[PDB]
Amino acid sequence: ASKLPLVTPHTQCRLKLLKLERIKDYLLMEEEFIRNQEQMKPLEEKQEEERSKVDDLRGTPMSVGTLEEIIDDNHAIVSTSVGSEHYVSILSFVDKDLLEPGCSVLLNHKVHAVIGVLMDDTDPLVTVMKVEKAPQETYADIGGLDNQIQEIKESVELPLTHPEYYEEMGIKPPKGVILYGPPGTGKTLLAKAVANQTSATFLRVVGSELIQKYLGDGPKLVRELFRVAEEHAPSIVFIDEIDAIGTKRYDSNSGGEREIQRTMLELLNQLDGFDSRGDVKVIMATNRIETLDPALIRPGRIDRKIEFPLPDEKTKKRIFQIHTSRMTLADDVTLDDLIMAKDDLSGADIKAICTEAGLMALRERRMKVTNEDFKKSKENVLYK
Amino acid sequence: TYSRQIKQVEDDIQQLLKKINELTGIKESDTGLAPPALWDLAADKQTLQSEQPLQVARCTKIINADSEDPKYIINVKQFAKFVVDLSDQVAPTDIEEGMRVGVDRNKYQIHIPLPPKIDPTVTMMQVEEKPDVTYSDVGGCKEQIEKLREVVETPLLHPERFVNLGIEPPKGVLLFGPPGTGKTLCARAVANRTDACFIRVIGSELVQKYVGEGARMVRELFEMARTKKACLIFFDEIDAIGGARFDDGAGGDNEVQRTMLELINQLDGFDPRGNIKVLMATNRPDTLDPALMRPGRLDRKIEFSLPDLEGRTHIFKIHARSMSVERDIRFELLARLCPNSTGAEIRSVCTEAGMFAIRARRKIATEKDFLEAVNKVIKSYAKFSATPRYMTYN
Amino acid sequence: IDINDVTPNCRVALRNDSYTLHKILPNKVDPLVSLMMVEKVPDSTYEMIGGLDKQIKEIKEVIELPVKHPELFEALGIAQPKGVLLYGPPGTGKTLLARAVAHHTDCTFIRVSGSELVQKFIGEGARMVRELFVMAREHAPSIIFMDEIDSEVQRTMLELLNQLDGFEATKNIKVIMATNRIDILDSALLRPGRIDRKIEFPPPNEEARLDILKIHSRKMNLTRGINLRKIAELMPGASG
Amino acid sequence: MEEGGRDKAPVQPQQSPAAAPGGTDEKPSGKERRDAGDKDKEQELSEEDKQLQDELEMLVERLGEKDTSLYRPALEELRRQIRSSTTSMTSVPKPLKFLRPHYGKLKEIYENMAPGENKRFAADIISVLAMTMSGERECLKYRLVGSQEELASWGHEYVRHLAGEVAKEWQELDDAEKVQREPLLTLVKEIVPYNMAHNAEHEACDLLMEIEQVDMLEKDIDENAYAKVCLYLTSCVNYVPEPENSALLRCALGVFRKFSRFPEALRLALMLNDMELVEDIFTSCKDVVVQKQMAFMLGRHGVFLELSEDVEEYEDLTEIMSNVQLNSNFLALARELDIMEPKVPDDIYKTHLENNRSARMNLASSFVNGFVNAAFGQDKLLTDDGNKWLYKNKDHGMLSAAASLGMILLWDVDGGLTQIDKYLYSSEDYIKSGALLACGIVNSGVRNECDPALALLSDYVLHNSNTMRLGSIFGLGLAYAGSNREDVLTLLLPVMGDSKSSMEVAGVTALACGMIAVGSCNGDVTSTILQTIMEKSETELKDTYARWLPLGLGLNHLGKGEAIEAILAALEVVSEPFRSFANTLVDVCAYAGSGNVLKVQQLLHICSEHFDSKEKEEDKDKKEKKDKDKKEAPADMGAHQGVAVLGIALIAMGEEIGAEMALRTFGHLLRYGEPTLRRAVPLALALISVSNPRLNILDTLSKFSHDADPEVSYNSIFAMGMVGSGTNNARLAAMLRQLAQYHAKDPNNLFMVRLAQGLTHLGKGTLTLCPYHSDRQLMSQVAVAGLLTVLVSFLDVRNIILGKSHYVLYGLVAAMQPRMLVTFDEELRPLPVSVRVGQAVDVVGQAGKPKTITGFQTHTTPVLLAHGERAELATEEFLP
């Protein structure tokens, strides 16, 4: 169990052999001196006899209850299920370290003393948002960009893989990243890829369900989210479409527009408040950046802002090349027509066109797609 | 050469480690049990001296007493109310009315006093730990530091000068200025330096589900503070909890207003708190309520403004003194190149210059990095800046 | 007694003082039976359709095909579509058709309206929304259906369509709603990629009304000579 | 997986060897043509270390193994050319041709004769071709031939030259971390026969690289911290001439040869001192060397620089005698004092305020006066806590107060007697003895001519009553603690040799005499042994005689790994077990710092428990107390294992040792500060523990916070102050709890008392620190012996700072930058040091315990370049 982490020679050098002998001899003598006494002073089994006595102290029916207060001096105030609470003692074999106010306890049936602790198999909301499997394909599936990817890697991935450049430089890596631009140009896609390659736990939540239907709930949700985020490990949090809180109103919201302000103040404090942050990164994205509160974006809460422009003819060519890989297509088609199909077609129109034309050819149980198929497919998807 | 020999030695010693680990006895993953060597004392004797001698002793709350002959009223949680007396081993003086007591289960007679409840959340709101920031990380604002330390800390460590001469020091202080200026950091500095307790509270923690909850929280907050000798309360982001009273039509913010009133009342009228100092902060203080800003509650109104010129060069000195950079660059020019900017921008400039050096291949940064960083974080991002809309204070 | 026979959520007798086990009891309780019995969805099939040929063609090729023939989409390789929207005047026959396909492809057709009776079955409080996924995966081949009469449903579907676009591992889950007035739905839902298909249901005309009369008059004792074509003609296209 | 077509290399070099036995005879031309083509092809195709799975290396042994077996040894007509193509090439696959048990078989291919200069075609390869073969041969063949029969055939004549040339080739390709592989051919080869290998490596490396010295130095010393006796002696003695012959470092020798002072030879250390006196280029090197040679890491040596030129050249040592101590007093007055100048008030101790909501405590208050008054803490009228108690009761209390007056003015020579004589006129058996001990303490370490036989001898000459006679031989020895003059030894010998009824005086005489001499004069140990032989015959009492007598002998023969002195001393005291109570004292006392785990295992093999029937209680106690040794500087591996052992065995399943004295082991372990201490000790200490002799718990409490370096954990002890009110009454712990609370911040600085300076060196401070741990046995000494020892037990604190100027005019104050402790082992590129660059300070106050500081502005610091805590900071600016 990590006896001696000084294994840094990691080679055929004499240091490793000598340290291994020293550990071996220490453990030899320790084994003899903690074994021979038990050979010569058993006095009882100590393997079942002591366990026999313990099983005797805790009577055969024993109840569950809730702890509510503790006085350190081995006896505390515990509640029963009915509602009336007591002032019982604490036995000594109960591991008086993992007792935290609220954990279930097992109480003796006669004198109600503290006997045992039940593991609290609850894990209620952790599993709802914590992504547990790789999203999809890495940076090889996205065509264009390159300038952006450099930055995302610098602010998210690179610190974890190579924590040697920065500390040598004396710089802490920049904190936050926001990605903004017109709709449907791959913000979420880059997020998925980053989740793919990375090693840290990835937590995702959409901004819209930050709002609720009762008072004093939004702040509770945000406190809980960041608590569970820092509970695990170096982790990455993704907050998506923030602008939704600041543009739409829903009747179920019992409060008015002031509770939204309260929620925003809570989130705004979570990033840089009175207490040490720990090791958590933040990534957020939106397509209306001119509506949210400029107090939220000041450096120290978010440093890199990356903008996503529309595709260009070279990138459009690359995109048509990517999205028709495993397509069994006839050489009759000419992509140059579709490149000039629209004045400013966006990236998602590409995948829309491809999938729709595939569907409409498969209508007739066929494998090859002709040109007139696209001629009707682009018209179907672009005009309505 | 002999990798196999040394590796097999390592394997044998690891196996022997786990072997003797089983041999002594810690195995069989527990459902709440301690290793046998620890409870050896409480296997034969502690059971026999902690099962027959000690009783259950239910816990109850006392209602009142009555005269000339002690007779007491006991209220338990789900049973009846009783009329009881005391036991011989406990003195009759220390059973002051209205506190938890422990009574036996047969004759129902008082045995021992107990400490009262205090809610579970308000207990965790204490600090119990102190951050790492010190007083040397606030370059540029010596005035404010002197002024605040003279109200929040000086009387505690020299409580004779004021008593000798005959003054009572103030009790409050407010900190305000545009975002990014650096008030929360001053609060951290104060927390690091002090010795008495220090309870931190954030305004959004004082909005609750049901009606009349926030007021209760404020009451027991100040009560728990009173229990101790004397210490600090830091409030953050006030403007979420009380601005002004503007009721019209249907009720709006009424509950939050009641919370604000209770907070106000706790500091004034009928035998005030005494040995407690508060400390607040905000971003847009124009919305604070007049009755809250009246002196007697907020004696000093410390103000944090945008750094001038010694502030900028000095912030550069502080945030760049841990850099591997060129030995012959001047930061005064850098101070001149950014007219109105906050400490945050200087921190980000240092970071981005380091990143430009690490970008290509270099090991130590030079002047061109700084000039490019200033050209990008100041002039290129300036369409997402708060300060043109937080100097009119809204 | 053996431990293995001691299943979770089982009724057992129990002696008085020692509280020791003694026997076993058959009855058990489940949530889904209670939620589905609250809902009362009407199972049906293709038999009752009148005048809905093309609509059933495309709804089947978008829904019924990519469960029984995933490899047929592997061959062409275009991804499997997941979002279908049905729109038209009220009372024209949306819900029955969605249930019809759900029955013909054997998927657990569940609908959600964000009410509170069934909320407790889903969870204790339901602070967030997607907890139904944690209940849907135990019965994976499922269809989510919603309806709008006269904006909460739109944000819910947006959260869902965002969810299962790369982050959800399980396959075989589709979502669909039906609502009128396309011109009023949100802008973010009109982007070419989010939704996959849109299908119009127009109010039935003469031939459709005649067929509907014939379908619904199969449980009634007619009379010799009705000329119900005249009856169909008298109705000036009300609805179905 | 297609085969054929491309089968050219895997066929032709497989078919030529198959017919090679038939080509051996009746075909002289073809055999040699094909042999040369195979040799050249295997040499060329195996030149680079990138194709480890060569198309010829792993494909010749499939069927050609029998051909190689029947062809090379079974030729019987070896020529002058076929052998060139056979031995040079067939031996290359012989490392991997056969199965794993091959190391004892290399003789049948290569050992006939090493082929020419095989490095000619094996110099461009890194870790594949032939150097691995050489390592394999040296692994078993050379070791088995030369174990006790080194003088033999070719297994040693050309093997040394081949090994030397391969080692030179190690620092020939890249000279990177593969140079650290040189020991794998030099240190690994002929371990116990390392003298000639090291001399060969030195003569090869003298002209190879001067800058490639420090790396090999540190590499060798990393294995030289612990080794066998012969290994340590040989390796250190061979490494000593390295920084002088090849490179000209010549500066760390004075500081790093303290490990080479005792373990190898003190005469060799004297030779190093002589050669250092020879090399006196300027003043930086000599001054930096002698800065730590009487105040840090030796003493009793100021007799070497008294030649005919003692003006400024040989007079420099004089400035270290008393001038450096005066500068120390001045810097305590200026640096630390200006920042903080307490009046010994103990206001911090008076922390009852903020929290809030007998004459025994006078001892604690007097200790509060003594502790905080360090670094020029003279008290004028502030000594009321001792002045009022000095003439009311508690003779031992007055004695302790007078003694603590000495520590109030610590390491002073200007006015210690001036302060002492103002109160010496007391006519008390206790005030006068404490006053003389205070006088000796004040000038202790100064090694000046304050009172060789003037102050304390005036008390000694009236030895007709205890205390007035006992406390008069220890204090003078403390004054001359750093000097080994035998004049004071003979003067104090009659104190012990008198065999007088003053048992306490004779014991403290043993302590006093042991704490001065550690080398020669076995006659003092002889006199002590004769005293114990003539004294302990008719007695079986407590350790009052035994807690003082054997300790002086043990210290006087402490830290010597020859063990011959230990064997003789143990054999000379053969007697009954009560008389032989000191048999195991000198046995372990000579084992301060070394790697001898065999001694550790035989320590507890003889006597583990024996059921502990009160028959060897003190014996097992002192056995466990001496088990604490070898862990103060265990190269970071012994400490963890030791603390785990003590936790597992004694306190968990034992008889009495664990629950009575297992807490001292942490005190002897370290005081750097680890959370497992402050979590494990209070685990057994928070509980009242009325079952066991709870006075042991009292000791544990009074010995818990012994960790120095003031920190923010004091709140724990204040919680104990809340738990110390009801239980743990004042009658035996009033001063002890407060002493625990003060132990961490005894002074506001001056806390280096951990007996580990430079890298891991002891600094000969065991003789002064140990007496506290020896006297703190557990019982019946906290009121008569504790107050007389616990006050002035430790006086070897290594100043308070590690960065300083000591320039010619003291112009510079401080210009440096600190980082964490060194944590680097191997790196094939630029080597590291520490990566905590965040701190950038220029103060001479706190320097940091486990920290390493570097400089800036590219000064190159050519004075010391390694370590010493008193860098000269020589100025060099040859780099615009």
Ligand SMILES: Nc1ncnc2c1ncn2[C@@H]1O[C@H](COP(=O)(O)OP(=O)(O)OP(=O)(O)O)[C@@H](O)[C@H]1O
């Ligand atoms: N440069 C591109 N390379 C490849 N695919 C692209 C590119 N730009 C857009 N796409 C396609 O467009 C689709 C829409 O992108 P995405 O879903 O990430 O939208 P978004 O930028 O987050 O915007 P919105 O907020 O409107 O959803 C992607 O799934 C991808 O298939």
Ligand SMILES: Nc1ncnc2c1ncn2[C@@H]1O[C@H](COP(=O)(O)OP(=O)(O)OP(=O)(O)O)[C@@H](O)[C@H]1O
């Ligand atoms: N005088 C200063 N010295 C050093 N750093 C400063 C100074 N003023 C500001 N900074 C830096 O700028 C940032 C200030 O943000 P901080 O978290 O303190 O919030 P604030 O300005 O108090 O208020 P808000 O939370 O409303 O933005 C910190 O990162 C700090 O490093």
Ligand SMILES: Nc1ncnc2c1ncn2[C@@H]1O[C@H](COP(=O)(O)OP(=O)(O)O)[C@@H](O)[C@H]1O
């Ligand atoms: N074309 C039709 N054929 C048969 N029944 C129909 C038709 N149109 C409507 N109905 C009847 O009208 C009811 C409502 O169906 P539907 O239109 O799917 O729901 P909604 O009216 O909410 O869209 C169904 O119960 C069905 O019996």
Ligand SMILES: [Mg+2]
């Ligand atoms: Mg998106």
Ligand SMILES: [Mg+2]
């Ligand atoms: Mg703030």
